[PDB]
Ligand binder design. Structure first.
Ligand code: NA
Ligand code: NA
Ligand code: NA
Ligand code: NA
Lengths: 332, 332, 332, 332
């Protein structure tokens, strides 16, 4: 049995996570789930967004499935639940996928999470400001090895996007990426971000595993969303040494919570990434989504008038149908 | 008389600049032109891409019209002609325009030229790399005042795009921009580059004067070109204290030089920026271009089979036609 | 029983440490000693200057008494034994004492050990070099609290020596020292190093606990030795959280090893610091040294022709004599 | 005729400068003097410590003789007169001499003046502070060439004192000093400041031309004064491209102004440096001072009860006596 920690969060988080968990249960009985509370209410009651004993159980889980959390502008002493989990679980890498639901093409963008690669300081001393940024071989290797394993797993290659023409840290990172990839027999292409943005708009689907330090990579990960009809479809993973946390890119959207119209696709595809991470059949979820959207009604963020449940049921129906066609969907 | 220094350059530079100069002569007799050589051939013969006595005459001119220059990968001692001119003439600001030729809408992107705003160092000391970047109030004010005057002139506003969330230099620059704009009664909007990229793809034409330090602004200035059918239409200006140099964004394209198919629109619209800069009727050039492209055949980079001359003549024809319609195109 | 780990080292280290241990045994039976090997010979046989199992026993000891170690110019893979121990035991503070043996006056100089306070990088990128240095509140507080406890223990005060006029890190450190001292009711004087050097030459004995970051403090700790007849008298301590290592400032002096002329005073006074650290009667050692030097013959580094043993015996004789005078040397 | 600009300053400045000028007039008629006002009174009357028209005349002079200036703790808008002159005249190098008046031995210490070599920033962003320091080849060469010419002129060598073991800027500077010296056939010794301080106390007179960046070199230049009976004897020069300003190290000492007890030796020896700088007979001044102090009464800062005038007259008497002994003091 794999043990998955479930952290629904706030607002639409619980709604979409219910859909994702129901989908996972429809594909495999090899996972069981334990649920945990986190957010402002937990902070009020214990001084931290998540309880220390819940964190300990989470650390020992095989994967985490996370919904979304509402973080107030200024609640003294409070720190974002997702930022806490990334820090406490050592989740140094973030992998975002923009899927083309019609075809199964994707844009894969790997960056470090906050403080996962660079450090240093910024300050004013009026009349002048300074920023210093430092990167090490050890930090560069760690994220390079991750992206390299991800490319290997996909039968793919790396597109390393950067500003090595201006920033020596980027030149350094590029060299390390090329070294690590070379060891593993994985092709590396590289590009200056400025011109690469044109390619990401015009030819998005053919860049393999995009890797960029987050100063530039977070630009790419947002720019790539122009190819999604809604942010509500977009999944992501947060990866560390021996554990990963999967979450939709969308937020807690408190203003539509309880309206039954949250897009569950992002959370459901995040579950598909979770299954892949555990060596299970994430592809069945993707094929089921693609099947559903051919003629299936979608939620209002995608221009349809489905309820969340209509989409969750319709996806589960596709999964069922595939699982029943023993000749068409064979094991492994 | 205004005195304009003309520096045709190499490859297609002379071809497109001939078109631009012919266009300028069609709108005004208040400018006369002096021509200057520059590039590799001048370097071979005198050790610098441009002669020191030619530079002196150029410094005293009212504006510079520049074509394009071929810069070899490694010619020991050689330094790019356009980089030399930016440096020697103190051209600290670059303003790029992506025009919508059907309508007259535009995307205006202001960044500093190389070393126009930030300084500091980058280095490796293996196992670690560092970058330090420094900005001052004086440098920030200078480019802010430029963008603010540009917004005032356009009856517009500034969209300041940045990474102030990560880089203190950007926070500092933002504050200075807001101060200078506030003094001049010019509205400032600001945006983090990551999300702004989505707006620049989806709603490009309604951002006023975009200002961004070049580390991010050069991303924007390339990304904005997705809205141009060809780079060959795109003009730019390089501005300093008391002189400016106008040039197409396109390069010297030596492989099509002499084929009579270079797009002259970028150079011609750069001439239109030059006329605006001198207080002359640049708008007549723009209206003439827009008129020509309604039904006019375009060069092969825009999917037509016109020669450069067909487009140059057709534009001049429009200018003539407008200048003859005394009721439709009145003075000032 | 207190448990002291003894690491004699090389050259004269074993010779002087024998004297120190014999002295400690003459004052107290409340300490027992365990001996450990370390240096090049241990490296040859196990790839590290000290065995990992010996380190583990050392970590659990109450104090460490260290002689001196010979570190070759370049022995690939080798790292100094004393540098290893400082690192592995987290010994962030170094306290050097220059004693006036005639009187019992002292110069006390506290600095951080390597990387105990500042970090950052230095690099060339030819034509330019850069150094970046970073200090944090947490690191500044830690060494400040140490020096403050040391001043309290001595019934003294802190002289904080710096270059706050030039380096912001020093200004920052000074402010933290003043805050911590203020909390504990300990007086802080401060001085720019440049002028302070004159006072340290002319009036050395009246500065209390001198505290300076090592960039300047290591200058002071060497300059202060002009008041010692020989480096061979000078003790020191290396302090961490819950353990400390005491060692003479002198080195392994392999060229006089076996000649029976090494000055044992530095090691013996380092033992006296060790006893103070454990709450035992270090003062008895100091009084015994002072008594011996009144008329006692000293080793050749101090202009006498005593052997090491003559001095060790003569000191132990003084200790014995004091311990026998129950009216003159009373408990506590 | 050489033209020397005289800037007496405040307090004891006028008193000691009168002595120096009288001494110069006693050795040569090849100099004439023009006097200029500067300080707080000039600031009150014109918004700058020195008048712009006086600065212009000063720039064209062959040398400057400067007394001392009183700089208030906080007079809004005011900037130190000597700091202004160093800046405005481009006086990048400072050479301090500690003389042994009994013998004619000296300690020569060369450092850059403020911002003469290093730049960069220091800042807090609370919880952390940073300092960045940058040096260039061009700045390093400039001061290296100065110290190298000074060593050549003295028939001497350079002792380069530094912290190259910790600071890469120092390592860089050391390499440049070694290169420049090597070209000119001048020996370079180098030393880490920490240990060098011991040598400067114990063996001060045998280090040739000491060169150190001011972060460390200003330590040395103060520490070296332990070998002077009073700061009042110590001269200095401030050197730039084509002009130099000579001044005593002592200050304006307003509390003894008008008491007739200011030591004129520092100013007089600064005049001797001025004459050397112009190719004139500074040595005659030094020999005359040394002669006077053999049995001559000195001012109260040196433990005598002479008035300033007694010392000025006694020195001039020695100069006269030497100039009359045509066999003992021959030309050149
Ligand atoms: Na999210
Ligand atoms: Na161009
Ligand atoms: Na030692
Ligand atoms: Na002075």
């Amino acid at each position: 049995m794999y043990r998955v920690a479930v952290i629904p969060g706030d607002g639409i988080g619980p709604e979409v996570i219910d859909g994702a968990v129901r989908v996972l249960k429809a594909v495999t009985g090899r996972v069981r789930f334990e649920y945990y509370e986190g957010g402002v209410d937990v902070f009020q009651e214990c001084g931290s967004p998540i309880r220390e004993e819940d964190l300990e159980e989470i650390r020992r889980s095989d994967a985490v499935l996370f919904g979304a959390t509402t973080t107030p502008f200024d609640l003294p002493g409070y720190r974002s639940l997702i930022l806490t989990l990334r820090k406490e679980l050592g989740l140094y890498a973030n992998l975002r996928i923009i899927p083309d639901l019609r075809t199964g093409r994707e844009i894969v963008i790997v960056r470090e999470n906050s403080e996962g690669l660079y450090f240093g300081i910024g300050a004013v001393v009026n009349g002048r400001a300074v920023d210093v940024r430092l990167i090490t071989r050890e930090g560069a290797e760690r994220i390079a090895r991750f992206a390299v394993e991800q490319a290997k797993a996909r039968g793919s290659f790396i597109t390393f996007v950067h500003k090595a023409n201006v920033l020596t840290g980027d030149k350094f990172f590029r060299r390390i990426v090329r070294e690590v990839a070379g060891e593993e027999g994985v092709e590396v292409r590289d590009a200056i971000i400025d011109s690469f943005t044109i390619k990401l708009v015009r030819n998005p689907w053919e860049h393999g595993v995009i890797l960029s330090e987050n100063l530039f990579g977070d630009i790419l990960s947002d720019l790539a969303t122009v190819h999604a009809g809604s942010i509500g479809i977009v999944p992501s993973g947060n990866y560390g040494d021996g554990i990963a946390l999967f979450e939709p890119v969308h937020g807690s959207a408190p203003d539509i919570a309880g309206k039954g119209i949250a897009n569950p696709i992002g959370a459901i595809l995040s579950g598909a990434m979770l299954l892949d991470y555990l060596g299970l059949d994430g592809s069945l979820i993707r094929a089921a989504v693609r099947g559903y959207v051919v003629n299936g009604e979608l939620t209002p963020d995608m221009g349809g008038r489905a309820r969340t449940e209509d989409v969750v049921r319709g996806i589960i129906g596709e999964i069922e149908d595939l699982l029943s066609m023993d000749e068409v969907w064979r094991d492994e």
